[PDB]
Each structure stands twice: as C-alpha cells, then as structure tokens.
Amino acid sequence: GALSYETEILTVEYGLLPIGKIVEKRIECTVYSVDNNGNIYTQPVAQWHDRGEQEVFEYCLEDGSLIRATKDHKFMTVDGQMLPIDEIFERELDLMRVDNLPNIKIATRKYLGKQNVYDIGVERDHNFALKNGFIASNAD
Question: Which residues carry a binding-site annotation?
Fold first, then answer.
C-alpha cells in the first residue's frame, strides 16, 4: 500500500514533510513510531518507496481531516490492530492517534483516481506518524 504525494509525515529534523518529497529526494530523516505498549519512539527512515501510479481514495475523518491512500495501506486502530484503511472505513473502526488525542472514525470515502504514490520503510515496528497523529503501518 501507499500514500498520496502530499501526505505529511512528522519528522524530528524538519517537522512535517510531504512523503512524496521525502521519497523523491531520499531525505534522511527521523520519524515517529508506536510500539505494542502504545508508546512513541523515534527511528530513521530506512527505505524510500516510489510505488508508481495507483488508485487513491480520500478518507474524510469525523473531524474533517483527510487521509489520501491506496485501499490497502494499513493504519492502526484502537484495539492495536493494523488494518487496511478501507477495512477500517468499512467496519467503522476508530483510528488510533498518538498517546492521548481523541480516537476518531472515518466518515466518508471518495475515489480520487490514479496518482503516483509513496511509502517509507523503518526497521522496528513498521509504522510512522502522519500529521494529526494517525499511525500508518506496513506490518505483516
């Protein structure tokens, strides 16, 4: 799975950067991850992935924030499961946010057609935080 170019990733060095720029420039940076105990820690980006043109859906959360992703990109839910975002939307599950922010559900889905999409890889846990504290995952 993969994320739209403009999806913003939290970094220690640079603050929020679009993942498309992080990948295209292979930016060396440190992102935020969550472990099984639900605690945050940092780690460097270890792989940069340009996944080419894929179908992108825009998921609009109850707070109005948007996540634009392929259907199969996993995200963390509140039971600590990492599930494809479309499944989270279809099963009406709350998305996990970092530490104590309110957990919220996806309200609607809108097809955006094919766009060039991106992913990053890390060495432990295989997840990373986006703007607003959502946790994108590529575990399993």
Answer: 119
108 contacts 60 by C-beta, under 8 angstroms:
yes
Q: Who contacts 28 (Cβ-Cβ below 8 Å, separation ≥6)?
A: 44, 45
Question: Which residue, among 45, 32, 20, 6, has the nearest Cα to 101 in the 3D structure?
Answer: 32
Which approach determined this entry? X-ray
End-to-end, the C-alpha distance of the chain in Å comes to 12
Please identify which residue in the block is written with the tokens 């060396």. Answer: 28
Is residue 72 classed exposed, middle or buried when 0-12, 13-18 and 19+ CB atoms within 10 A define those classes? Answer: middle
User: In a 3-state reduction of DSSP, which class is residue 3?
Assistant: strand
Could you give the number of structural domains in the chain? 1
Give Cα 9 to chain centroid, integer Å: 8
**What CATH number did the domain enclosing 65 receive?**
2.170.16.10
Residue ranges for the known binding site for Ca(2+) are 119
